[PDB]
Each structure stands twice: as C-alpha cells, then as structure tokens.
C-alpha cells in the first residue's frame, strides 16, 4: 500500500500541470489565435 | 428492378410501365388518349453557348 512517491508526488505534479499550463500555454495558444484575428481585420 | 443503376432513370420506369399498360390492353381500350400516349415526338436538342444544335434525336 506504499503510495508516498506514487500518489503525493503525482498529485502535486498534476497541480503543476493544472496551474502552469492554464496560466502559460493554452493562454498563449489563444494569444496566437487572437493576434491572428486582430491582424486579419 | 435496376432502373436507378442499370436502367435510364425512375422516369423511364414510369414511361415503360405506362406504355406497357396502355399498349397491352383490349382493342376497345385504345382510345384517343391512349393514341396520344403512344405517339411521342419530343425531338430534344442539345444547345450550347453559341446555340450549337447537336441533334433533334427522338425521345
């Protein structure tokens, strides 16, 4: 039932995904899209 | 049966069905309307941009 390095570390890492990606990556993909929109008008 | 694939079209299906019904009947049933149905003279012609009449082939 040893889950210290399998559950806690993975859980913290997935917080890192949920926070860092939604702060940086999908926002700058949408920034690419909206910049293309802006130059296209 | 195969009007859509092998036959001409569905309209040809009605055409052949009506022709069979009218022609394959009694002698007294061949009235004036049946005579008009049997007689076909639709000479369709394929025009073009320059009105090039291909041919007035019978229907």
């Amino acid at each position: 039932f040893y889950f210290m390095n399998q559950l806690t570390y993975g859980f913290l890492l997935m917080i890192t995904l949920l926070i860092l990606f939604s702060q940086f990556f999908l926002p700058m993909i949408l920034r690419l899209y909206v910049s293309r929109l802006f130059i296209s008008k | 049966s195969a009007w859509r694939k092998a036959g001409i079209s569905y309209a040809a299906y009605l055409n052949v069905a009506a022709q069979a019904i009218r022609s394959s009947l009694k002698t007294e049933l061949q009235t004036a309307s049946v005579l008009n149905r049997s007689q076909t003279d639709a000479f369709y012609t394929q025009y073009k941009n320059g009105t090039a009449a291909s041919e007035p082939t019978p229907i």
């Binding site: - | 049966s1 195969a2 694939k5 092998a6």
Partner: protein, 74 residues
C-alpha cells in the same frame, strides 16, 4: 495421473466450441452478401472478389479454434 490427459480431452472438447464464431460468421457474411446482390444485381462482380478475402479471414478463426483444440488432443 491420468487427470492430465482427461482434462486435455475436456479442454479440446470445449475448444471445439470455438467453432460457433466461424459458423455463425460464415452464416451472416454469406447472407448479407446475398442481400447485397439482391439489392444491386450489377454489384456481384465487385462484391464477391472482396468477399473471398473475408471468407479466408472467417475460416481463419475456425482453424485457429480448431488448432488450439488440437493442441489439447495430440
């Protein structure tokens, strides 16, 4: 001591029960081929040659079940 051969024998017998897949398989594919040819008389020459490939594929499951049964017989 003879239980090994005995169990081999019931295993092969129930492994012949793998033949139902192939049986009802041949059944449905041939029947649907019949229906398709009935709907389009001019499509038989384009359906049968491809159908042979799937007939080989559906005999494949039959002979697979047959040979796993045979491994338990000989």
């Amino acid at each position: 001591m003879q239980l090994v051969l005995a169990a081999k024998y019931i295993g092969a017998g129930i492994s012949t029960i793998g033949l139902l897949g192939a049986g009802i398989g041949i059944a449905i594919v041939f029947a649907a081929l019949i229906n398709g040819v009935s709907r389009n008389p001019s499509i038989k020459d384009t359906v049968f040659p491809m159908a042979i490939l799937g007939f080989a594929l559906s005999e494949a499951t039959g002979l697979f079940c047959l040979m796993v049964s045979f491994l338990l017989l000989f």
